[PDB]
mmCIF file of N, CA and C and ligand atoms in Angstrom:
data_model
loop_
_atom_site.group_PDB
_atom_site.id
_atom_site.type_symbol
_atom_site.label_atom_id
_atom_site.label_comp_id
_atom_site.label_asym_id
_atom_site.label_seq_id
_atom_site.Cartn_x
_atom_site.Cartn_y
_atom_site.Cartn_z
ATOM 1 N N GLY A 1 90.543 -79.450 3.988
ATOM 2 C CA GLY A 1 91.540 -79.552 5.041
ATOM 3 C C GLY A 1 92.846 -80.114 4.533
ATOM 4 N N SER A 2 93.047 -80.002 3.219
ATOM 5 C CA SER A 2 94.227 -80.596 2.600
ATOM 6 C C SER A 2 95.502 -79.882 3.030
ATOM 7 N N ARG A 3 95.488 -78.548 3.085
ATOM 8 C CA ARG A 3 96.710 -77.856 3.476
ATOM 9 C C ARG A 3 97.095 -78.197 4.908
ATOM 10 N N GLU A 4 96.113 -78.270 5.812
ATOM 11 C CA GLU A 4 96.440 -78.596 7.197
ATOM 12 C C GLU A 4 97.009 -80.005 7.319
ATOM 13 N N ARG A 5 96.394 -80.986 6.649
ATOM 14 C CA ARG A 5 96.899 -82.354 6.733
ATOM 15 C C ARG A 5 98.300 -82.465 6.144
ATOM 16 N N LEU A 6 98.564 -81.745 5.055
ATOM 17 C CA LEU A 6 99.860 -81.870 4.396
ATOM 18 C C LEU A 6 100.968 -81.219 5.216
ATOM 19 N N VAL A 7 100.675 -80.076 5.839
ATOM 20 C CA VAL A 7 101.637 -79.430 6.728
ATOM 21 C C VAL A 7 101.939 -80.323 7.925
ATOM 22 N N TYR A 8 100.913 -80.981 8.470
ATOM 23 C CA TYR A 8 101.148 -81.941 9.541
ATOM 24 C C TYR A 8 102.075 -83.055 9.075
ATOM 25 N N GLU A 9 101.902 -83.517 7.834
ATOM 26 C CA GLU A 9 102.786 -84.556 7.310
ATOM 27 C C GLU A 9 104.211 -84.042 7.151
ATOM 28 N N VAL A 10 104.364 -82.778 6.756
ATOM 29 C CA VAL A 10 105.686 -82.155 6.735
ATOM 30 C C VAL A 10 106.321 -82.228 8.117
ATOM 31 N N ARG A 11 105.571 -81.839 9.148
ATOM 32 C CA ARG A 11 106.101 -81.878 10.509
ATOM 33 C C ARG A 11 106.460 -83.297 10.939
ATOM 34 N N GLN A 12 105.656 -84.284 10.549
ATOM 35 C CA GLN A 12 105.957 -85.666 10.900
ATOM 36 C C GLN A 12 107.029 -86.291 10.004
ATOM 37 N N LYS A 13 107.668 -85.491 9.143
ATOM 38 C CA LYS A 13 108.735 -85.946 8.244
ATOM 39 C C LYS A 13 108.262 -87.017 7.263
ATOM 40 N N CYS A 14 106.980 -86.974 6.901
ATOM 41 C CA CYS A 14 106.390 -87.870 5.917
ATOM 42 C C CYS A 14 106.141 -87.189 4.578
ATOM 43 N N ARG A 15 106.593 -85.947 4.414
ATOM 44 C CA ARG A 15 106.319 -85.167 3.216
ATOM 45 C C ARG A 15 107.300 -84.005 3.190
ATOM 46 N N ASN A 16 107.798 -83.662 2.002
ATOM 47 C CA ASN A 16 108.680 -82.509 1.843
ATOM 48 C C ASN A 16 107.827 -81.284 1.552
ATOM 49 N N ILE A 17 108.125 -80.174 2.230
ATOM 50 C CA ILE A 17 107.338 -78.962 2.015
ATOM 51 C C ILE A 17 107.453 -78.485 0.575
ATOM 52 N N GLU A 18 108.556 -78.819 -0.099
ATOM 53 C CA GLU A 18 108.717 -78.447 -1.496
ATOM 54 C C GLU A 18 107.697 -79.140 -2.396
ATOM 55 N N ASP A 19 107.049 -80.196 -1.907
ATOM 56 C CA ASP A 19 106.128 -81.002 -2.699
ATOM 57 C C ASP A 19 104.672 -80.609 -2.522
ATOM 58 N N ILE A 20 104.386 -79.604 -1.708
ATOM 59 C CA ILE A 20 103.025 -79.117 -1.529
ATOM 60 C C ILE A 20 102.981 -77.643 -1.902
ATOM 61 N N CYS A 21 101.810 -77.186 -2.345
ATOM 62 C CA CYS A 21 101.593 -75.751 -2.508
ATOM 63 C C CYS A 21 101.356 -75.143 -1.130
ATOM 64 N N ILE A 22 102.294 -74.310 -0.669
ATOM 65 C CA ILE A 22 102.151 -73.727 0.662
ATOM 66 C C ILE A 22 101.026 -72.712 0.738
ATOM 67 N N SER A 23 100.525 -72.240 -0.405
ATOM 68 C CA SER A 23 99.421 -71.282 -0.413
ATOM 69 C C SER A 23 98.077 -71.964 -0.186
ATOM 70 N N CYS A 24 97.810 -73.060 -0.899
ATOM 71 C CA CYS A 24 96.483 -73.673 -0.861
ATOM 72 C C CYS A 24 96.445 -75.146 -0.483
ATOM 73 N N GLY A 25 97.572 -75.847 -0.492
ATOM 74 C CA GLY A 25 97.578 -77.263 -0.201
ATOM 75 C C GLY A 25 97.519 -78.182 -1.401
ATOM 76 N N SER A 26 97.452 -77.646 -2.619
ATOM 77 C CA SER A 26 97.455 -78.503 -3.801
ATOM 78 C C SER A 26 98.769 -79.262 -3.907
ATOM 79 N N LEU A 27 98.687 -80.499 -4.394
ATOM 80 C CA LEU A 27 99.869 -81.292 -4.700
ATOM 81 C C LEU A 27 100.338 -81.096 -6.131
ATOM 82 N N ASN A 28 99.627 -80.285 -6.911
ATOM 83 C CA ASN A 28 100.017 -79.993 -8.288
ATOM 84 C C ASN A 28 100.961 -78.792 -8.321
ATOM 85 N N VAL A 29 102.106 -78.996 -7.673
ATOM 86 C CA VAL A 29 103.159 -77.991 -7.635
ATOM 87 C C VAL A 29 103.735 -77.821 -9.030
ATOM 88 N N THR A 30 103.818 -76.577 -9.489
ATOM 89 C CA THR A 30 104.432 -76.284 -10.773
ATOM 90 C C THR A 30 105.644 -75.373 -10.670
ATOM 91 N N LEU A 31 105.910 -74.796 -9.503
ATOM 92 C CA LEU A 31 107.083 -73.959 -9.326
ATOM 93 C C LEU A 31 107.402 -73.899 -7.845
ATOM 94 N N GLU A 32 108.633 -73.501 -7.551
ATOM 95 C CA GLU A 32 108.994 -73.173 -6.183
ATOM 96 C C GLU A 32 108.356 -71.844 -5.804
ATOM 97 N N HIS A 33 107.812 -71.773 -4.592
ATOM 98 C CA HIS A 33 107.302 -70.504 -4.112
ATOM 99 C C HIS A 33 108.444 -69.487 -4.117
ATOM 100 N N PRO A 34 108.209 -68.262 -4.596
ATOM 101 C CA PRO A 34 109.336 -67.327 -4.770
ATOM 102 C C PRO A 34 109.873 -66.756 -3.475
ATOM 103 N N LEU A 35 109.081 -66.733 -2.406
ATOM 104 C CA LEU A 35 109.462 -66.095 -1.150
ATOM 105 C C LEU A 35 109.886 -67.083 -0.076
ATOM 106 N N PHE A 36 109.262 -68.258 -0.018
ATOM 107 C CA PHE A 36 109.504 -69.206 1.058
ATOM 108 C C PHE A 36 109.792 -70.577 0.483
ATOM 109 N N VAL A 37 110.561 -71.361 1.234
ATOM 110 C CA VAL A 37 110.763 -72.753 0.866
ATOM 111 C C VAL A 37 109.412 -73.452 0.871
ATOM 112 N N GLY A 38 109.133 -74.195 -0.185
ATOM 113 C CA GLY A 38 107.829 -74.794 -0.395
ATOM 114 C C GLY A 38 107.399 -74.595 -1.834
ATOM 115 N N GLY A 39 106.432 -75.408 -2.265
ATOM 116 C CA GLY A 39 105.958 -75.353 -3.628
ATOM 117 C C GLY A 39 104.805 -74.383 -3.814
ATOM 118 N N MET A 40 104.386 -74.259 -5.067
ATOM 119 C CA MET A 40 103.247 -73.427 -5.437
ATOM 120 C C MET A 40 102.595 -74.030 -6.674
ATOM 121 N N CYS A 41 101.262 -74.012 -6.711
ATOM 122 C CA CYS A 41 100.533 -74.488 -7.873
ATOM 123 C C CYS A 41 100.300 -73.335 -8.846
ATOM 124 N N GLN A 42 99.909 -73.684 -10.071
ATOM 125 C CA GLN A 42 99.754 -72.649 -11.088
ATOM 126 C C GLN A 42 98.586 -71.718 -10.779
ATOM 127 N N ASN A 43 97.516 -72.236 -10.171
ATOM 128 C CA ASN A 43 96.406 -71.371 -9.782
ATOM 129 C C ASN A 43 96.854 -70.328 -8.770
ATOM 130 N N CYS A 44 97.622 -70.746 -7.756
ATOM 131 C CA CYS A 44 98.095 -69.779 -6.771
ATOM 132 C C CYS A 44 99.106 -68.814 -7.371
ATOM 133 N N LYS A 45 99.902 -69.262 -8.342
ATOM 134 C CA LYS A 45 100.779 -68.318 -9.022
ATOM 135 C C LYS A 45 99.968 -67.210 -9.678
ATOM 136 N N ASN A 46 98.893 -67.581 -10.377
ATOM 137 C CA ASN A 46 98.062 -66.576 -11.027
ATOM 138 C C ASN A 46 97.441 -65.648 -10.004
ATOM 139 N N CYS A 47 96.957 -66.202 -8.889
ATOM 140 C CA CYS A 47 96.398 -65.366 -7.831
ATOM 141 C C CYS A 47 97.453 -64.414 -7.300
ATOM 142 N N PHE A 48 98.653 -64.941 -7.032
ATOM 143 C CA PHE A 48 99.731 -64.115 -6.506
ATOM 144 C C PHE A 48 100.039 -62.977 -7.462
ATOM 145 N N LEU A 49 100.088 -63.271 -8.768
ATOM 146 C CA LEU A 49 100.337 -62.229 -9.755
ATOM 147 C C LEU A 49 99.235 -61.178 -9.733
ATOM 148 N N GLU A 50 97.975 -61.619 -9.670
ATOM 149 C CA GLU A 50 96.853 -60.688 -9.736
ATOM 150 C C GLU A 50 96.705 -59.892 -8.449
ATOM 151 N N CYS A 51 97.063 -60.485 -7.311
ATOM 152 C CA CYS A 51 96.893 -59.834 -6.020
ATOM 153 C C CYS A 51 98.111 -59.038 -5.587
ATOM 154 N N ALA A 52 99.247 -59.217 -6.252
ATOM 155 C CA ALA A 52 100.489 -58.610 -5.793
ATOM 156 C C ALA A 52 100.391 -57.093 -5.812
ATOM 157 N N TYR A 53 100.733 -56.482 -4.683
ATOM 158 C CA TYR A 53 100.874 -55.037 -4.579
ATOM 159 C C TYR A 53 99.556 -54.297 -4.786
ATOM 160 N N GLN A 54 98.433 -54.964 -4.507
ATOM 161 C CA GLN A 54 97.149 -54.289 -4.337
ATOM 162 C C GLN A 54 97.043 -53.871 -2.879
ATOM 163 N N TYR A 55 96.526 -52.667 -2.646
ATOM 164 C CA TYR A 55 96.521 -52.042 -1.329
ATOM 165 C C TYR A 55 95.117 -51.648 -0.892
ATOM 166 N N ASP A 56 94.830 -51.869 0.388
ATOM 167 C CA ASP A 56 93.600 -51.389 0.997
ATOM 168 C C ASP A 56 93.734 -49.913 1.375
ATOM 169 N N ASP A 57 92.616 -49.326 1.806
ATOM 170 C CA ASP A 57 92.599 -47.902 2.128
ATOM 171 C C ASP A 57 93.403 -47.559 3.376
ATOM 172 N N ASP A 58 93.845 -48.556 4.142
ATOM 173 C CA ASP A 58 94.735 -48.303 5.267
ATOM 174 C C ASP A 58 96.203 -48.249 4.866
ATOM 175 N N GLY A 59 96.509 -48.424 3.587
ATOM 176 C CA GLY A 59 97.877 -48.335 3.121
ATOM 177 C C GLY A 59 98.668 -49.616 3.244
ATOM 178 N N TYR A 60 98.050 -50.711 3.665
ATOM 179 C CA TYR A 60 98.738 -51.988 3.725
ATOM 180 C C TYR A 60 98.179 -52.904 2.650
ATOM 181 N N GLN A 61 98.939 -53.943 2.318
ATOM 182 C CA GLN A 61 98.529 -54.811 1.222
ATOM 183 C C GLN A 61 97.198 -55.502 1.504
ATOM 184 N N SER A 62 96.420 -55.672 0.438
ATOM 185 C CA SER A 62 95.076 -56.227 0.568
ATOM 186 C C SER A 62 95.091 -57.705 0.917
ATOM 187 N N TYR A 63 96.063 -58.453 0.406
ATOM 188 C CA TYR A 63 95.987 -59.902 0.354
ATOM 189 C C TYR A 63 97.196 -60.508 1.040
ATOM 190 N N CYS A 64 96.943 -61.555 1.821
ATOM 191 C CA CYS A 64 98.002 -62.248 2.532
ATOM 192 C C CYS A 64 99.094 -62.685 1.570
ATOM 193 N N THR A 65 100.338 -62.431 1.972
ATOM 194 C CA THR A 65 101.491 -62.791 1.155
ATOM 195 C C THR A 65 101.534 -64.291 0.854
ATOM 196 N N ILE A 66 101.025 -65.126 1.750
ATOM 197 C CA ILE A 66 101.109 -66.573 1.562
ATOM 198 C C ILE A 66 99.898 -67.137 0.810
ATOM 199 N N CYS A 67 98.666 -66.846 1.224
ATOM 200 C CA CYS A 67 97.506 -67.521 0.644
ATOM 201 C C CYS A 67 96.693 -66.648 -0.298
ATOM 202 N N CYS A 68 97.070 -65.384 -0.462
ATOM 203 C CA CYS A 68 96.378 -64.401 -1.294
ATOM 204 C C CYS A 68 94.982 -64.053 -0.801
ATOM 205 N N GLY A 69 94.628 -64.429 0.424
ATOM 206 C CA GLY A 69 93.340 -64.076 0.977
ATOM 207 C C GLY A 69 93.494 -63.382 2.310
ATOM 208 N N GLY A 70 92.747 -63.836 3.303
ATOM 209 C CA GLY A 70 92.928 -63.318 4.643
ATOM 210 C C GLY A 70 91.915 -62.253 5.032
ATOM 211 N N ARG A 71 91.619 -62.204 6.328
ATOM 212 C CA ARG A 71 90.752 -61.182 6.906
ATOM 213 C C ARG A 71 91.541 -60.532 8.039
ATOM 214 N N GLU A 72 91.548 -61.123 9.240
ATOM 215 C CA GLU A 72 92.459 -60.659 10.283
ATOM 216 C C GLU A 72 93.911 -60.972 9.897
ATOM 217 N N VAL A 73 94.771 -59.951 9.953
ATOM 218 C CA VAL A 73 96.140 -60.070 9.457
ATOM 219 C C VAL A 73 97.136 -59.394 10.396
ATOM 220 N N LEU A 74 98.375 -59.894 10.357
ATOM 221 C CA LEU A 74 99.549 -59.194 10.876
ATOM 222 C C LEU A 74 100.064 -58.290 9.766
ATOM 223 N N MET A 75 100.412 -57.048 10.113
ATOM 224 C CA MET A 75 100.785 -56.050 9.114
ATOM 225 C C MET A 75 102.190 -55.537 9.396
ATOM 226 N N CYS A 76 103.064 -55.634 8.394
ATOM 227 C CA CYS A 76 104.461 -55.249 8.555
ATOM 228 C C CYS A 76 104.605 -53.752 8.796
ATOM 229 N N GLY A 77 105.393 -53.398 9.804
ATOM 230 C CA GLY A 77 105.670 -52.008 10.088
ATOM 231 C C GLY A 77 106.756 -51.363 9.250
ATOM 232 N N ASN A 78 107.404 -52.105 8.349
ATOM 233 C CA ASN A 78 108.390 -51.523 7.439
ATOM 234 C C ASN A 78 107.644 -50.867 6.286
ATOM 235 N N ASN A 79 107.746 -49.541 6.195
ATOM 236 C CA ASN A 79 106.995 -48.795 5.193
ATOM 237 C C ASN A 79 107.477 -49.060 3.775
ATOM 238 N N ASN A 80 108.664 -49.632 3.609
ATOM 239 C CA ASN A 80 109.099 -50.078 2.295
ATOM 240 C C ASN A 80 108.499 -51.422 1.920
ATOM 241 N N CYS A 81 107.755 -52.044 2.838
ATOM 242 C CA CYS A 81 107.267 -53.405 2.653
ATOM 243 C C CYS A 81 105.744 -53.451 2.661
ATOM 244 N N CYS A 82 105.101 -53.186 3.802
ATOM 245 C CA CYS A 82 103.651 -53.063 3.904
ATOM 246 C C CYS A 82 102.924 -54.371 3.653
ATOM 247 N N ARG A 83 103.603 -55.509 3.760
ATOM 248 C CA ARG A 83 102.962 -56.795 3.539
ATOM 249 C C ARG A 83 102.068 -57.179 4.719
ATOM 250 N N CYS A 84 101.128 -58.076 4.442
ATOM 251 C CA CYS A 84 100.254 -58.637 5.462
ATOM 252 C C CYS A 84 100.315 -60.154 5.414
ATOM 253 N N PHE A 85 100.166 -60.772 6.582
ATOM 254 C CA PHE A 85 100.160 -62.223 6.731
ATOM 255 C C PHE A 85 98.941 -62.599 7.558
ATOM 256 N N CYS A 86 98.083 -63.467 7.029
ATOM 257 C CA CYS A 86 96.859 -63.772 7.759
ATOM 258 C C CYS A 86 97.147 -64.691 8.944
ATOM 259 N N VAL A 87 96.279 -64.611 9.952
ATOM 260 C CA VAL A 87 96.514 -65.373 11.179
ATOM 261 C C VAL A 87 96.471 -66.871 10.918
ATOM 262 N N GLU A 88 95.667 -67.307 9.954
ATOM 263 C CA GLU A 88 95.573 -68.736 9.671
ATOM 264 C C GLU A 88 96.875 -69.273 9.090
ATOM 265 N N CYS A 89 97.475 -68.558 8.139
ATOM 266 C CA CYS A 89 98.742 -69.027 7.582
ATOM 267 C C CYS A 89 99.837 -69.055 8.637
ATOM 268 N N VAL A 90 99.849 -68.061 9.538
ATOM 269 C CA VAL A 90 100.901 -68.003 10.550
ATOM 270 C C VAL A 90 100.756 -69.155 11.534
ATOM 271 N N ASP A 91 99.530 -69.397 12.013
ATOM 272 C CA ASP A 91 99.334 -70.514 12.925
ATOM 273 C C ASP A 91 99.634 -71.853 12.260
ATOM 274 N N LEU A 92 99.423 -71.965 10.945
ATOM 275 C CA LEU A 92 99.667 -73.246 10.282
ATOM 276 C C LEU A 92 101.150 -73.481 10.026
ATOM 277 N N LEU A 93 101.826 -72.493 9.438
ATOM 278 C CA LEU A 93 103.193 -72.691 8.950
ATOM 279 C C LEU A 93 104.267 -72.313 9.964
ATOM 280 N N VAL A 94 104.060 -71.279 10.776
ATOM 281 C CA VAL A 94 104.964 -71.044 11.895
ATOM 282 C C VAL A 94 104.672 -72.023 13.024
ATOM 283 N N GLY A 95 103.426 -72.047 13.490
ATOM 284 C CA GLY A 95 102.961 -73.074 14.396
ATOM 285 C C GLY A 95 101.854 -72.568 15.292
ATOM 286 N N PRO A 96 101.157 -73.479 15.974
ATOM 287 C CA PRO A 96 100.041 -73.078 16.840
ATOM 288 C C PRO A 96 100.416 -71.984 17.834
ATOM 289 N N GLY A 97 99.599 -70.930 17.878
ATOM 290 C CA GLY A 97 99.810 -69.828 18.794
ATOM 291 C C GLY A 97 100.721 -68.734 18.274
ATOM 292 N N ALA A 98 101.398 -68.957 17.153
ATOM 293 C CA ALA A 98 102.369 -67.975 16.676
ATOM 294 C C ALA A 98 101.706 -66.660 16.297
ATOM 295 N N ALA A 99 100.487 -66.706 15.760
ATOM 296 C CA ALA A 99 99.862 -65.468 15.306
ATOM 297 C C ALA A 99 99.560 -64.550 16.477
ATOM 298 N N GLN A 100 98.939 -65.093 17.523
ATOM 299 C CA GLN A 100 98.575 -64.268 18.666
ATOM 300 C C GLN A 100 99.786 -63.888 19.507
ATOM 301 N N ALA A 101 100.919 -64.563 19.322
ATOM 302 C CA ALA A 101 102.159 -64.090 19.920
ATOM 303 C C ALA A 101 102.791 -62.969 19.107
ATOM 304 N N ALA A 102 102.619 -62.984 17.782
ATOM 305 C CA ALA A 102 103.192 -61.932 16.948
ATOM 306 C C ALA A 102 102.526 -60.578 17.169
ATOM 307 N N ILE A 103 101.329 -60.548 17.742
ATOM 308 C CA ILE A 103 100.667 -59.277 18.026
ATOM 309 C C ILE A 103 101.223 -58.628 19.295
ATOM 310 N N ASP A 104 105.513 -55.182 18.955
ATOM 311 C CA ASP A 104 105.280 -53.782 18.615
ATOM 312 C C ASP A 104 106.575 -52.967 18.647
ATOM 313 N N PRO A 105 107.022 -52.483 17.474
ATOM 314 C CA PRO A 105 106.389 -52.729 16.174
ATOM 315 C C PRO A 105 106.715 -54.130 15.681
ATOM 316 N N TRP A 106 106.119 -54.539 14.566
ATOM 317 C CA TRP A 106 106.305 -55.885 14.045
ATOM 318 C C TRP A 106 106.893 -55.803 12.647
ATOM 319 N N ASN A 107 108.090 -56.357 12.477
ATOM 320 C CA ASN A 107 108.652 -56.568 11.155
ATOM 321 C C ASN A 107 108.232 -57.951 10.677
ATOM 322 N N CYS A 108 107.761 -58.028 9.435
ATOM 323 C CA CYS A 108 107.222 -59.280 8.928
ATOM 324 C C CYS A 108 108.341 -60.279 8.633
ATOM 325 N N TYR A 109 107.924 -61.478 8.222
ATOM 326 C CA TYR A 109 108.840 -62.575 7.948
ATOM 327 C C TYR A 109 109.825 -62.262 6.831
ATOM 328 N N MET A 110 109.492 -61.336 5.924
ATOM 329 C CA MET A 110 110.445 -60.937 4.895
ATOM 330 C C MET A 110 111.448 -59.909 5.395
ATOM 331 N N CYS A 111 111.124 -59.176 6.463
ATOM 332 C CA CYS A 111 111.960 -58.069 6.915
ATOM 333 C C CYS A 111 112.784 -58.365 8.163
ATOM 334 N N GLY A 112 112.400 -59.357 8.969
ATOM 335 C CA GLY A 112 113.115 -59.623 10.202
ATOM 336 C C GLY A 112 114.521 -60.140 9.970
ATOM 337 N N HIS A 113 115.347 -60.036 11.014
ATOM 338 C CA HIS A 113 116.726 -60.496 10.887
ATOM 339 C C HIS A 113 116.767 -62.001 10.649
ATOM 340 N N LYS A 114 116.010 -62.755 11.439
ATOM 341 C CA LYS A 114 115.897 -64.192 11.237
ATOM 342 C C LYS A 114 115.054 -64.501 10.008
ATOM 343 N N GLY A 115 115.388 -65.609 9.360
ATOM 344 C CA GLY A 115 114.643 -66.055 8.204
ATOM 345 C C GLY A 115 113.847 -67.327 8.429
ATOM 346 N N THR A 116 114.025 -67.991 9.574
ATOM 347 C CA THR A 116 113.350 -69.255 9.868
ATOM 348 C C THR A 116 112.352 -69.046 10.998
ATOM 349 N N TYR A 117 111.076 -69.365 10.731
ATOM 350 C CA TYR A 117 109.987 -69.238 11.708
ATOM 351 C C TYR A 117 109.192 -70.543 11.624
ATOM 352 N N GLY A 118 109.555 -71.525 12.446
ATOM 353 C CA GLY A 118 108.909 -72.823 12.333
ATOM 354 C C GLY A 118 109.148 -73.443 10.971
ATOM 355 N N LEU A 119 108.063 -73.862 10.316
ATOM 356 C CA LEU A 119 108.168 -74.412 8.973
ATOM 357 C C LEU A 119 108.236 -73.339 7.895
ATOM 358 N N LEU A 120 108.133 -72.064 8.256
ATOM 359 C CA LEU A 120 108.199 -70.979 7.284
ATOM 360 C C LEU A 120 109.645 -70.505 7.190
ATOM 361 N N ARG A 121 110.267 -70.684 6.021
ATOM 362 C CA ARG A 121 111.677 -70.349 5.828
ATOM 363 C C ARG A 121 111.802 -69.426 4.625
ATOM 364 N N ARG A 122 112.330 -68.232 4.857
ATOM 365 C CA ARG A 122 112.500 -67.243 3.797
ATOM 366 C C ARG A 122 113.598 -67.691 2.832
ATOM 367 N N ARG A 123 113.327 -67.591 1.527
ATOM 368 C CA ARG A 123 114.333 -67.955 0.533
ATOM 369 C C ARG A 123 115.423 -66.898 0.472
ATOM 370 N N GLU A 124 116.679 -67.359 0.374
ATOM 371 C CA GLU A 124 117.820 -66.446 0.346
ATOM 372 C C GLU A 124 117.707 -65.435 -0.786
ATOM 373 N N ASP A 125 117.320 -65.896 -1.972
ATOM 374 C CA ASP A 125 117.336 -65.078 -3.175
ATOM 375 C C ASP A 125 115.961 -64.517 -3.517
ATOM 376 N N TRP A 126 115.134 -64.223 -2.510
ATOM 377 C CA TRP A 126 113.750 -63.838 -2.788
ATOM 378 C C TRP A 126 113.596 -62.556 -3.605
ATOM 379 N N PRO A 127 114.409 -61.500 -3.429
ATOM 380 C CA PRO A 127 114.201 -60.311 -4.272
ATOM 381 C C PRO A 127 114.426 -60.590 -5.743
ATOM 382 N N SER A 128 115.495 -61.317 -6.071
ATOM 383 C CA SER A 128 115.743 -61.680 -7.461
ATOM 384 C C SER A 128 114.740 -62.719 -7.950
ATOM 385 N N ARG A 129 114.309 -63.631 -7.072
ATOM 386 C CA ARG A 129 113.295 -64.604 -7.465
ATOM 387 C C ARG A 129 112.007 -63.916 -7.886
ATOM 388 N N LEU A 130 111.620 -62.853 -7.178
ATOM 389 C CA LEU A 130 110.427 -62.114 -7.573
ATOM 390 C C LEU A 130 110.584 -61.521 -8.964
ATOM 391 N N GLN A 131 111.789 -61.069 -9.305
ATOM 392 C CA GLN A 131 112.004 -60.526 -10.640
ATOM 393 C C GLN A 131 111.721 -61.576 -11.702
ATOM 394 N N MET A 132 112.188 -62.803 -11.478
ATOM 395 C CA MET A 132 111.923 -63.889 -12.411
ATOM 396 C C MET A 132 110.454 -64.283 -12.379
ATOM 397 N N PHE A 133 109.853 -64.269 -11.187
ATOM 398 C CA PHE A 133 108.450 -64.647 -11.039
ATOM 399 C C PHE A 133 107.531 -63.708 -11.817
ATOM 400 N N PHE A 134 107.803 -62.407 -11.771
ATOM 401 C CA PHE A 134 106.965 -61.426 -12.457
ATOM 402 C C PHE A 134 107.343 -61.254 -13.931
HETATM 403 MG MG1 MG B 201 90.153 -57.447 2.249
HETATM 404 ZN ZN1 ZN B 202 97.982 -73.500 -4.616
HETATM 405 ZN ZN1 ZN B 203 97.121 -66.406 4.491
HETATM 406 ZN ZN1 ZN B 204 107.933 -56.685 5.811
#
């Protein structure tokens, strides 16, 4: 329950989101997350690299953009994107109830006009950051 407790501490202004891995909750941050404000640990970086741009038979990405896992997911309707975000990450980082409110069509957090969704904030330079990340 480390990720949940740490996100709660972020909300209570007792912790900077840059100091936690937003994917798994590890405090062993080794880089800035390339897509969102917040940290990332080296294990999650490796997972992100290995899971990036793998696709299920429905044509959408296999693995949640944030935690690299997921079962029930929100799926981006932008065909140039095709990303998925699991309901657990959305309820944690956007906030309680956000996932079931996000369920037409749906542009994901990387594609929408707004970049701030609760504690989830899209990085300005994310396309170029991905180039450096990969
Ligand atoms: Mg799967
Ligand atoms: Zn991690
Ligand atoms: Zn997730
Ligand atoms: Zn998208």
